[PDB]
Amino acid sequence: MNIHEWQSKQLIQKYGGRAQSGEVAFSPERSRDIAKKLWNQFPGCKFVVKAQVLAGGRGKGHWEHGMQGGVKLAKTPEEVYEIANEMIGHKLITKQTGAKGINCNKVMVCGAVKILKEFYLSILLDRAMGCPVIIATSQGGMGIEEVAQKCPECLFKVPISVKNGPTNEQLVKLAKDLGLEGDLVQDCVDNVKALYQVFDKCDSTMVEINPLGVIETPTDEKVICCFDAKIAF
Amino acid sequence: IHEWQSKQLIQKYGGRAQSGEVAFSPERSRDIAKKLWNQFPGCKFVVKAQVGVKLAKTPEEVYEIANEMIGHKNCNKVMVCGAVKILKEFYLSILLDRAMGCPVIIATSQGGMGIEEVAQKCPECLFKVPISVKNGPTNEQLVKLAKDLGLEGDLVQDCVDNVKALYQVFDKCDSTMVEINPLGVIETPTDEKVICCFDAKIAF
Ligand SMILES: Nc1ncnc2c1ncn2[C@@H]1O[C@H](COP(=O)(O)OP(=O)(O)O)[C@@H](O)[C@H]1O
Ligand SMILES: [Mg+2]
Protein backbone atom coordinates (compact mmCIF):
# COMPACT_ATOMS: atom_id res chain seq x y z
CA MET A 1 0.00 0.00 0.00
CA ASN A 2 1.69 3.17 -1.23
CA ILE A 3 1.29 6.61 0.35
CA HIS A 4 -1.11 7.64 -2.42
CA GLU A 5 -3.60 4.86 -1.67
CA TRP A 6 -3.23 4.95 2.12
CA GLN A 7 -3.90 8.70 2.19
CA SER A 8 -7.15 7.90 0.36
CA LYS A 9 -8.49 5.36 2.87
CA GLN A 10 -7.96 8.04 5.52
CA LEU A 11 -10.25 10.43 3.64
CA ILE A 12 -13.14 7.98 4.08
CA GLN A 13 -13.38 8.91 7.76
CA LYS A 14 -12.62 12.58 7.03
CA TYR A 15 -15.48 12.91 4.51
CA GLY A 16 -17.96 11.34 6.96
CA GLY A 17 -17.49 7.65 6.17
CA ARG A 18 -17.20 4.81 8.66
CA ALA A 19 -14.64 2.08 8.01
CA GLN A 20 -12.69 -0.63 9.80
CA SER A 21 -9.05 -0.54 8.71
CA GLY A 22 -7.69 -2.81 11.43
CA GLU A 23 -3.93 -2.57 11.79
CA VAL A 24 -1.13 -4.04 9.69
CA ALA A 25 1.46 -6.39 11.18
CA PHE A 26 4.60 -7.62 9.43
CA SER A 27 5.43 -10.25 12.09
CA PRO A 28 3.40 -12.68 14.21
CA GLU A 29 4.82 -11.01 17.33
CA ARG A 30 3.45 -7.63 16.26
CA SER A 31 0.14 -9.30 15.38
CA ARG A 32 -0.01 -10.58 18.96
CA ASP A 33 0.80 -7.19 20.49
CA ILE A 34 -1.97 -5.55 18.44
CA ALA A 35 -4.56 -8.03 19.71
CA LYS A 36 -3.19 -7.67 23.25
CA LYS A 37 -3.50 -3.87 23.19
CA LEU A 38 -7.04 -4.16 21.82
CA TRP A 39 -8.00 -6.45 24.72
CA ASN A 40 -7.22 -3.54 27.06
CA GLN A 41 -10.20 -1.68 25.55
CA PHE A 42 -12.71 -4.46 24.71
CA PRO A 43 -11.74 -7.38 26.96
CA GLY A 44 -12.78 -10.82 25.80
CA CYS A 45 -13.35 -9.62 22.25
CA LYS A 46 -12.38 -11.81 19.31
CA PHE A 47 -10.14 -10.92 16.38
CA VAL A 48 -10.06 -11.48 12.63
CA VAL A 49 -6.68 -12.10 10.98
CA LYS A 50 -6.71 -11.28 7.26
CA ALA A 51 -3.88 -12.26 4.94
CA GLN A 52 -2.92 -9.20 2.89
CA VAL A 53 -2.47 -10.51 -0.65
CA LEU A 54 -3.72 -8.98 -3.90
CA ALA A 55 -6.11 -11.83 -4.67
CA GLY A 56 -9.77 -12.61 -4.09
CA GLY A 57 -11.33 -15.53 -2.27
CA ARG A 58 -8.87 -15.34 0.62
CA GLY A 59 -11.43 -16.74 3.05
CA LYS A 60 -11.80 -19.64 0.59
CA GLY A 61 -8.15 -20.44 -0.16
CA HIS A 62 -5.72 -22.61 1.79
CA TRP A 63 -2.09 -22.50 2.89
CA GLU A 64 0.71 -24.75 1.69
CA HIS A 65 1.35 -26.14 5.20
CA GLY A 66 -2.11 -27.32 6.33
CA MET A 67 -4.03 -24.25 7.47
CA GLN A 68 -7.34 -23.39 5.82
CA GLY A 69 -8.60 -19.90 5.02
CA GLY A 70 -7.20 -16.44 4.34
CA VAL A 71 -9.57 -14.76 6.82
CA LYS A 72 -9.63 -16.46 10.22
CA LEU A 73 -11.39 -15.87 13.52
CA ALA A 74 -9.12 -15.81 16.58
CA LYS A 75 -10.17 -16.06 20.22
CA THR A 76 -7.01 -14.78 21.92
CA PRO A 77 -3.82 -12.86 21.11
CA GLU A 78 -1.98 -16.19 21.14
CA GLU A 79 -4.30 -17.62 18.49
CA VAL A 80 -3.54 -14.42 16.56
CA TYR A 81 0.17 -15.23 16.83
CA GLU A 82 -0.46 -18.81 15.67
CA ILE A 83 -2.57 -17.80 12.67
CA ALA A 84 -0.32 -14.89 11.68
CA ASN A 85 2.76 -17.12 11.89
CA GLU A 86 1.20 -19.51 9.36
CA MET A 87 0.45 -16.56 7.03
CA ILE A 88 3.46 -14.22 7.11
CA GLY A 89 6.12 -15.61 4.80
CA HIS A 90 4.04 -18.41 3.27
CA LYS A 91 2.13 -19.05 0.06
CA LEU A 92 -1.66 -18.77 -0.15
CA ILE A 93 -3.61 -20.53 -2.91
CA THR A 94 -7.03 -19.45 -4.21
CA LYS A 95 -9.02 -19.66 -7.43
CA GLN A 96 -7.07 -16.66 -8.73
CA THR A 97 -3.87 -18.72 -8.52
CA GLY A 98 -4.89 -22.34 -9.09
CA ALA A 99 -1.80 -23.54 -7.24
CA LYS A 100 0.95 -21.12 -8.28
CA GLY A 101 1.06 -19.78 -4.72
CA ILE A 102 0.94 -16.15 -3.58
CA ASN A 103 3.42 -15.15 -0.88
CA CYS A 104 2.05 -13.20 2.09
CA ASN A 105 4.30 -10.75 3.95
CA LYS A 106 1.75 -9.03 6.22
CA VAL A 107 -1.66 -9.41 7.85
CA MET A 108 -4.50 -7.23 9.08
CA VAL A 109 -5.44 -7.74 12.72
CA CYS A 110 -9.07 -6.66 13.04
CA GLY A 111 -11.46 -6.55 15.96
CA ALA A 112 -14.20 -9.12 15.52
CA VAL A 113 -17.44 -7.22 14.90
CA LYS A 114 -21.03 -8.41 14.68
CA ILE A 115 -22.17 -8.16 11.05
CA LEU A 116 -25.93 -8.13 10.42
CA LYS A 117 -25.97 -7.59 6.64
CA GLU A 118 -23.29 -7.57 3.95
CA PHE A 119 -23.35 -5.63 0.69
CA TYR A 120 -21.04 -5.01 -2.23
CA LEU A 121 -20.54 -1.47 -3.50
CA SER A 122 -18.05 0.08 -5.91
CA ILE A 123 -17.66 3.37 -7.75
CA LEU A 124 -16.09 2.96 -11.19
CA LEU A 125 -15.04 5.27 -14.01
CA ASP A 126 -16.94 3.76 -16.94
CA ARG A 127 -14.86 4.59 -20.02
CA ALA A 128 -17.59 3.69 -22.51
CA MET A 129 -19.82 6.16 -20.64
CA GLY A 130 -17.22 8.74 -19.62
CA CYS A 131 -18.79 9.15 -16.18
CA PRO A 132 -18.77 7.49 -12.75
CA VAL A 133 -21.19 4.67 -11.99
CA ILE A 134 -22.13 3.20 -8.60
CA ILE A 135 -22.49 -0.60 -8.65
CA ALA A 136 -24.04 -2.43 -5.71
CA THR A 137 -25.75 -5.68 -4.78
CA SER A 138 -27.34 -7.11 -1.64
CA GLN A 139 -26.24 -10.73 -2.17
CA GLY A 140 -23.38 -9.50 0.02
CA GLY A 141 -21.47 -12.71 0.57
CA MET A 142 -21.22 -13.96 -3.01
CA GLY A 143 -18.75 -11.39 -4.38
CA ILE A 144 -19.27 -9.17 -7.41
CA GLU A 145 -17.62 -11.21 -10.17
CA GLU A 146 -19.84 -14.21 -9.42
CA VAL A 147 -23.05 -12.17 -9.21
CA ALA A 148 -22.40 -10.20 -12.41
CA GLN A 149 -21.71 -13.18 -14.68
CA LYS A 150 -24.39 -15.48 -13.25
CA CYS A 151 -27.19 -13.03 -12.35
CA PRO A 152 -28.12 -10.24 -14.81
CA GLU A 153 -30.50 -8.06 -12.84
CA CYS A 154 -29.03 -8.67 -9.36
CA LEU A 155 -26.84 -5.57 -9.68
CA PHE A 156 -27.89 -1.98 -9.06
CA LYS A 157 -26.15 0.41 -11.46
CA VAL A 158 -26.38 4.19 -11.09
CA PRO A 159 -24.67 6.61 -13.51
CA ILE A 160 -23.43 9.75 -11.78
CA SER A 161 -23.25 13.35 -12.97
CA VAL A 162 -19.66 14.53 -13.31
CA LYS A 163 -20.51 18.12 -12.37
CA ASN A 164 -23.11 17.41 -9.67
CA GLY A 165 -21.95 14.03 -8.39
CA PRO A 166 -24.58 11.78 -6.82
CA THR A 167 -27.93 13.17 -5.72
CA ASN A 168 -29.71 12.46 -2.44
CA GLU A 169 -32.63 10.93 -4.35
CA GLN A 170 -30.15 8.68 -6.16
CA LEU A 171 -28.46 7.58 -2.93
CA VAL A 172 -31.67 7.33 -0.89
CA LYS A 173 -33.32 4.99 -3.38
CA LEU A 174 -30.11 2.94 -3.56
CA ALA A 175 -30.14 2.65 0.23
CA LYS A 176 -33.77 1.56 -0.11
CA ASP A 177 -33.03 -0.81 -3.00
CA LEU A 178 -30.57 -2.57 -0.66
CA GLY A 179 -33.31 -3.24 1.90
CA LEU A 180 -32.27 -0.49 4.32
CA GLU A 181 -34.96 1.26 6.36
CA GLY A 182 -35.04 3.59 9.33
CA ASP A 183 -31.93 5.53 10.27
CA LEU A 184 -29.72 3.12 8.30
CA VAL A 185 -31.02 4.78 5.11
CA GLN A 186 -29.42 8.14 5.89
CA ASP A 187 -26.35 6.45 7.40
CA CYS A 188 -25.78 4.59 4.12
CA VAL A 189 -26.29 7.81 2.14
CA ASP A 190 -23.65 9.60 4.22
CA ASN A 191 -21.17 6.75 3.73
CA VAL A 192 -21.64 6.50 -0.04
CA LYS A 193 -21.38 10.30 -0.25
CA ALA A 194 -18.07 10.03 1.60
CA LEU A 195 -16.96 7.24 -0.75
CA TYR A 196 -17.67 9.39 -3.81
CA GLN A 197 -15.94 12.40 -2.25
CA VAL A 198 -12.86 10.16 -2.04
CA PHE A 199 -13.44 8.78 -5.54
CA ASP A 200 -13.37 12.27 -7.07
CA LYS A 201 -10.99 14.13 -4.73
CA CYS A 202 -8.32 11.49 -5.44
CA ASP A 203 -8.83 11.04 -9.20
CA SER A 204 -9.56 7.40 -8.45
CA THR A 205 -10.45 4.81 -11.08
CA MET A 206 -12.26 2.50 -8.64
CA VAL A 207 -13.40 2.68 -5.02
CA GLU A 208 -14.44 -0.83 -3.97
CA ILE A 209 -16.02 -1.72 -0.61
CA ASN A 210 -16.50 -5.45 -0.01
CA PRO A 211 -18.26 -5.93 2.35
CA LEU A 212 -20.23 -2.76 2.94
CA GLY A 213 -21.89 -3.94 6.13
CA VAL A 214 -24.59 -3.20 8.64
CA ILE A 215 -22.83 -3.94 11.93
CA GLU A 216 -23.47 -3.60 15.64
CA THR A 217 -21.05 -1.60 17.77
CA PRO A 218 -19.87 -3.01 21.12
CA THR A 219 -22.81 -1.15 22.69
CA ASP A 220 -25.19 -2.39 19.97
CA GLU A 221 -25.92 0.63 17.78
CA LYS A 222 -26.56 -0.46 14.19
CA VAL A 223 -24.29 1.41 11.78
CA ILE A 224 -22.98 1.26 8.23
CA CYS A 225 -19.30 0.28 8.12
CA CYS A 226 -16.87 -0.19 5.23
CA PHE A 227 -14.60 -3.24 5.29
CA ASP A 228 -11.53 -4.00 3.18
CA ALA A 229 -11.82 -0.78 1.20
CA LYS A 230 -9.74 -0.79 -1.99
CA ILE A 231 -8.77 2.07 -4.31
CA ALA A 232 -7.14 1.93 -7.74
CA PHE A 233 -5.64 4.44 -10.17
CA ILE B 1 -0.49 0.46 43.80
CA HIS B 2 -1.88 2.70 41.08
CA GLU B 3 -4.93 1.64 39.08
CA TRP B 4 -3.00 1.07 35.84
CA GLN B 5 -0.38 -1.12 37.54
CA SER B 6 -3.04 -3.11 39.41
CA LYS B 7 -5.04 -3.98 36.28
CA GLN B 8 -1.73 -5.02 34.71
CA LEU B 9 -1.09 -7.52 37.52
CA ILE B 10 -4.61 -8.94 37.28
CA GLN B 11 -4.23 -9.79 33.59
CA LYS B 12 -0.82 -11.38 34.18
CA TYR B 13 -2.38 -13.89 36.59
CA GLY B 14 -5.32 -14.69 34.30
CA GLY B 15 -7.84 -11.98 35.12
CA ARG B 16 -9.84 -9.88 32.67
CA ALA B 17 -9.70 -6.11 33.14
CA GLN B 18 -10.30 -3.00 31.05
CA SER B 19 -7.19 -0.82 31.24
CA GLY B 20 -8.13 1.75 28.64
CA GLU B 21 -5.20 3.91 27.57
CA VAL B 22 -3.64 6.90 29.29
CA ALA B 23 -3.52 10.39 27.79
CA PHE B 24 -1.66 13.40 29.18
CA SER B 25 -3.45 15.94 26.96
CA PRO B 26 -6.86 16.45 25.33
CA GLU B 27 -5.18 16.08 21.94
CA ARG B 28 -3.82 12.64 22.82
CA SER B 29 -7.21 11.66 24.25
CA ARG B 30 -8.78 12.38 20.86
CA ASP B 31 -6.12 10.40 18.98
CA ILE B 32 -6.69 7.34 21.17
CA ALA B 33 -10.43 7.43 20.47
CA LYS B 34 -9.73 7.95 16.76
CA LYS B 35 -7.45 4.91 16.46
CA LEU B 36 -10.01 2.86 18.39
CA TRP B 37 -12.59 3.68 15.70
CA ASN B 38 -10.32 1.83 13.25
CA GLN B 39 -10.97 -1.43 15.14
CA PHE B 40 -14.55 -0.97 16.39
CA PRO B 41 -16.09 1.77 14.24
CA GLY B 42 -19.00 3.60 15.81
CA CYS B 43 -18.11 2.57 19.35
CA LYS B 44 -18.53 4.98 22.25
CA PHE B 45 -15.90 5.98 24.79
CA VAL B 46 -15.58 6.39 28.55
CA VAL B 47 -13.23 9.10 29.85
CA LYS B 48 -11.94 8.76 33.42
CA ALA B 49 -10.16 11.63 35.14
CA GLN B 50 -7.09 10.37 36.99
CA VAL B 51 -5.13 11.68 39.97
CA GLY B 52 -14.92 12.13 37.05
CA VAL B 53 -16.22 9.60 34.52
CA LYS B 54 -18.07 10.63 31.38
CA LEU B 55 -19.46 8.92 28.30
CA ALA B 56 -18.43 10.27 24.89
CA LYS B 57 -19.80 9.56 21.42
CA THR B 58 -16.99 10.85 19.17
CA PRO B 59 -13.26 11.52 19.43
CA GLU B 60 -14.26 15.19 19.44
CA GLU B 61 -16.49 14.81 22.50
CA VAL B 62 -13.58 12.91 24.08
CA TYR B 63 -11.39 15.96 23.46
CA GLU B 64 -13.97 18.33 24.95
CA ILE B 65 -14.44 16.19 28.07
CA ALA B 66 -10.70 15.66 28.54
CA ASN B 67 -10.18 19.41 28.14
CA GLU B 68 -12.53 20.06 31.07
CA MET B 69 -10.73 17.42 33.16
CA ILE B 70 -7.00 17.86 32.51
CA GLY B 71 -5.64 20.98 34.17
CA HIS B 72 -8.64 21.37 36.50
CA LYS B 73 -9.82 20.34 39.97
CA ASN B 74 -5.63 18.77 40.19
CA CYS B 75 -6.21 16.32 37.34
CA ASN B 76 -3.31 15.98 34.89
CA LYS B 77 -4.19 12.81 32.94
CA VAL B 78 -7.17 10.82 31.68
CA MET B 79 -7.80 7.20 30.77
CA VAL B 80 -9.68 6.74 27.49
CA CYS B 81 -11.69 3.52 27.43
CA GLY B 82 -13.92 1.90 24.87
CA ALA B 83 -17.54 1.90 25.98
CA VAL B 84 -18.55 -1.68 26.82
CA LYS B 85 -22.06 -3.05 27.32
CA ILE B 86 -22.50 -3.84 31.02
CA LEU B 87 -25.14 -6.25 32.33
CA LYS B 88 -24.32 -6.50 36.05
CA GLU B 89 -22.06 -4.65 38.48
CA PHE B 90 -20.62 -6.53 41.45
CA TYR B 91 -18.21 -5.68 44.24
CA LEU B 92 -15.43 -8.07 45.20
CA SER B 93 -12.40 -7.75 47.45
CA ILE B 94 -9.86 -9.99 49.16
CA LEU B 95 -8.95 -8.65 52.61
CA LEU B 96 -6.56 -9.74 55.34
CA ASP B 97 -9.15 -9.95 58.13
CA ARG B 98 -7.07 -9.47 61.29
CA ALA B 99 -9.85 -10.50 63.69
CA MET B 100 -10.11 -13.93 62.06
CA GLY B 101 -6.41 -14.10 61.15
CA CYS B 102 -6.83 -15.15 57.52
CA PRO B 103 -7.74 -13.72 54.10
CA VAL B 104 -11.43 -13.14 53.46
CA ILE B 105 -13.34 -12.67 50.21
CA ILE B 106 -16.08 -10.03 50.44
CA ALA B 107 -18.58 -9.69 47.61
CA THR B 108 -21.90 -8.01 46.89
CA SER B 109 -24.34 -7.65 44.03
CA GLN B 110 -24.25 -3.92 44.87
CA GLY B 111 -21.50 -2.83 42.53
CA GLY B 112 -20.71 0.85 42.16
CA MET B 113 -21.32 1.66 45.84
CA GLY B 114 -18.77 2.01 48.61
CA ILE B 115 -18.46 -1.14 50.69
CA GLU B 116 -18.73 0.86 53.92
CA GLU B 117 -22.20 2.08 52.91
CA VAL B 118 -23.51 -1.24 51.57
CA ALA B 119 -22.53 -3.20 54.68
CA GLN B 120 -23.88 -0.45 56.95
CA LYS B 121 -27.36 -0.47 55.40
CA CYS B 122 -27.44 -3.94 53.76
CA PRO B 123 -25.40 -6.22 56.03
CA GLU B 124 -27.71 -8.95 54.74
CA CYS B 125 -26.18 -8.89 51.25
CA LEU B 126 -22.44 -9.24 51.94
CA PHE B 127 -20.89 -12.63 51.15
CA LYS B 128 -17.87 -13.38 53.36
CA VAL B 129 -15.62 -16.35 52.61
CA PRO B 130 -12.57 -17.01 54.83
CA ILE B 131 -9.58 -18.45 52.99
CA SER B 132 -7.14 -21.07 54.28
CA VAL B 133 -3.87 -19.38 53.32
CA LYS B 134 -2.19 -22.81 53.22
CA ASN B 135 -4.54 -24.21 50.55
CA GLY B 136 -5.71 -20.77 49.42
CA PRO B 137 -9.21 -20.51 47.98
CA THR B 138 -10.78 -23.78 46.87
CA ASN B 139 -12.75 -24.09 43.65
CA GLU B 140 -15.68 -25.36 45.73
CA GLN B 141 -15.85 -22.10 47.69
CA LEU B 142 -15.76 -20.06 44.49
CA VAL B 143 -18.52 -21.95 42.65
CA LYS B 144 -20.95 -21.25 45.50
CA LEU B 145 -19.97 -17.58 45.66
CA ALA B 146 -20.65 -17.39 41.92
CA LYS B 147 -24.04 -19.11 42.23
CA ASP B 148 -24.92 -16.94 45.24
CA LEU B 149 -24.33 -13.89 43.00
CA GLY B 150 -26.82 -15.08 40.38
CA LEU B 151 -24.28 -16.41 37.88
CA GLU B 152 -24.98 -19.40 35.64
CA GLY B 153 -23.54 -20.91 32.49
CA ASP B 154 -19.95 -20.20 31.52
CA LEU B 155 -20.03 -17.11 33.76
CA VAL B 156 -19.68 -19.31 36.86
CA GLN B 157 -16.34 -20.73 35.73
CA ASP B 158 -15.29 -17.35 34.32
CA CYS B 159 -15.87 -15.89 37.79
CA VAL B 160 -13.79 -18.61 39.45
CA ASP B 161 -10.94 -17.91 37.03
CA ASN B 162 -10.96 -14.18 37.76
CA VAL B 163 -11.34 -14.56 41.53
CA LYS B 164 -8.50 -17.10 41.54
CA ALA B 165 -6.34 -14.59 39.65
CA LEU B 166 -7.23 -11.87 42.17
CA TYR B 167 -6.12 -14.08 45.06
CA GLN B 168 -2.78 -14.59 43.31
CA VAL B 169 -2.31 -10.82 43.14
CA PHE B 170 -3.26 -10.72 46.83
CA ASP B 171 -0.95 -13.59 47.78
CA LYS B 172 1.97 -12.85 45.45
CA CYS B 173 2.10 -9.13 46.29
CA ASP B 174 1.58 -9.82 50.02
CA SER B 175 -1.23 -7.28 49.86
CA THR B 176 -3.72 -6.42 52.60
CA MET B 177 -6.55 -5.62 50.16
CA VAL B 178 -7.37 -6.32 46.52
CA GLU B 179 -10.61 -4.52 45.67
CA ILE B 180 -12.57 -4.68 42.41
CA ASN B 181 -15.38 -2.13 42.18
CA PRO B 182 -17.10 -2.60 39.77
CA LEU B 183 -16.52 -6.23 38.85
CA GLY B 184 -18.81 -6.44 35.83
CA VAL B 185 -20.57 -9.01 33.71
CA ILE B 186 -20.19 -7.49 30.25
CA GLU B 187 -20.87 -8.39 26.62
CA THR B 188 -17.96 -8.44 24.18
CA PRO B 189 -18.57 -6.78 20.79
CA THR B 190 -19.86 -10.14 19.50
CA ASP B 191 -22.16 -10.56 22.53
CA GLU B 192 -20.19 -13.12 24.56
CA LYS B 193 -20.82 -12.70 28.29
CA VAL B 194 -17.62 -12.50 30.37
CA ILE B 195 -16.36 -11.20 33.70
CA CYS B 196 -14.38 -7.96 33.65
CA CYS B 197 -12.62 -5.82 36.26
CA PHE B 198 -13.12 -2.11 35.62
CA ASP B 199 -11.29 -0.73 38.67
CA ALA B 200 -8.63 -2.10 40.98
CA LYS B 201 -7.17 -1.01 44.32
CA ILE B 202 -4.24 -2.72 46.06
CA ALA B 203 -3.14 -1.76 49.57
CA PHE B 204 0.04 -2.57 51.48
N1 LIG C 1 -13.70 -7.41 11.41
C1 LIG C 1 -14.52 -8.43 11.14
N2 LIG C 1 -15.31 -8.91 12.13
C2 LIG C 1 -16.14 -9.92 11.86
N3 LIG C 1 -16.32 -10.56 10.70
C3 LIG C 1 -15.53 -10.07 9.74
C4 LIG C 1 -14.62 -9.03 9.87
N4 LIG C 1 -13.98 -8.80 8.67
C5 LIG C 1 -14.50 -9.68 7.85
N5 LIG C 1 -15.45 -10.48 8.44
C6 LIG C 1 -16.25 -11.51 7.79
O1 LIG C 1 -15.38 -12.41 7.13
C7 LIG C 1 -15.57 -12.33 5.70
C8 LIG C 1 -14.23 -12.36 5.02
O2 LIG C 1 -14.41 -12.06 3.62
P1 LIG C 1 -13.78 -10.81 2.83
O3 LIG C 1 -12.70 -10.16 3.61
O4 LIG C 1 -14.95 -9.90 2.45
O5 LIG C 1 -13.23 -11.44 1.48
P2 LIG C 1 -13.03 -12.94 0.99
O6 LIG C 1 -14.31 -13.32 0.23
O7 LIG C 1 -11.88 -12.90 -0.02
O8 LIG C 1 -12.76 -13.83 2.15
C9 LIG C 1 -16.40 -11.08 5.46
O9 LIG C 1 -17.23 -11.23 4.31
C10 LIG C 1 -17.23 -10.97 6.74
O10 LIG C 1 -18.40 -11.77 6.69
MG1 LIG D 1 -24.39 -6.46 21.21
Swiss-Prot record, chain B:
Taxonomy, superkingdom: Eukaryota
Species name: Blastocystis sp. subtype 1 (strain ATCC 50177 / NandII)
Family statement: Belongs to the succinate/malate CoA ligase beta subunit family.
Amino-acid positions noted as binding ATP in the UniProt annotation, renumbered to this chain: 48, 89
Residues annotated to bind Mg(2+): 181, 199
Compartment(s): Hydrogenosome
Subunit structure: Heterodimer of an alpha and a beta subunit.
Function description: Succinyl-CoA synthetase functions in the citric acid cycle (TCA), coupling the hydrolysis of succinyl-CoA to the synthesis of ATP and thus represents the only step of substrate-level phosphorylation in the TCA. The beta subunit provides nucleotide specificity of the enzyme and binds the substrate succinate, while the binding sites for coenzyme A and phosphate are found in the alpha subunit.
Protein name: Succinate--CoA ligase [ADP-forming] subunit beta
Site entry: Important for substrate specificity: 44, 85
